[PDB]
Paper text:
Despite large sequence variations, all BRD modules share a conserved fold that comprises a left-handed bundle of four α helices (αZ, αA, αB, αC), linked by loop regions of variable length (ZA and BC loops), which line the Kac binding site and determine binding specificity.
In contrast, this domain showed strong interaction with diacetylated H3 (H3K4acK9ac) but not with the same peptide acetylated at K4 but trimethylated at K9 (H3K4acK9me3). The strongest interaction was observed using diacetylated H3K4acK9ac in combination with phosphorylation at T3. The second BET BRDs bound to tetra-acetyl H4 peptides with about 10-fold weaker affinities, suggesting that the first BRD in BET proteins recognizes the H4 tail. In contrast, the second BRDs of BET BRDs bound either weakly (BRD2), not at all (BRD3), or promiscuously ([name]) to histone sequences and their variants present in this array. In contrast, diacetylation had only a modest effect on binding affinities of the second BRD of [name]. As reported for interactions with single acetylation sites in the case of the BRDs of BRD2 (Umehara et al., 2010), alanine mutants of the conserved asparagine (N140 and N443 in the first and second BRDs in [name]) did also abolish binding of diacetylated peptides in both SPOT assays as well as in ITC. Similarly, our array and ITC studies on [name] showed that the first BRD of this protein has high affinity for the histone H4 tail, whereas the second BRD most likely recognizes multiply acetylated marks in histone H3.
Author numbering: 349 to 459
């Protein structure tokens, strides 16, 4: 039940990682590299970084009590992107495309 919803979450994150979505999902695969040129202020702006690899690790370590906790982290990931980046930045458009995939699957999780 919660077990079933957590399995659904794993499939969702699996699809997010799939070749199908790779053209827009790739910036979200790994933590933001705060040592990269231009990101020297990232941690000043973003208090709680999150990325898909970290989410994968947390699912695998059974650190989400339920699908709502999983969803919170996925949304945190997107919101950090919307907060930090200029609203016309290509990465914001990419985030939206990936979020469309997530929201549609997450909505259709049986309950």
């Amino acid at each position: 039940k919660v077990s079933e919803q957590l399995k659904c979450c794993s499939g969702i994150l699996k699809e997010m990682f799939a070749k199908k979505h790779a053209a827009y999902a790739w910036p979200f695969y790994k933590p933001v590299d705060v040592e990269a040129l231009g990101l020297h202020d990232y941690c000043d702006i973003i208090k709680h970084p999150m990325d898909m690899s970290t989410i994968k690790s947390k699912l695998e370590a059974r650190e989400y009590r339920d699908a709502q906790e999983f969803g919170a982290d996925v949304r945190l990931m997107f919101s950090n992107c919307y907060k930090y980046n200029p609203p016309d930045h290509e990465v914001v458009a990419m985030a939206r495309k990936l979020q469309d995939v997530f929201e549609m699957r997450f909505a259709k999780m049986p309950d």
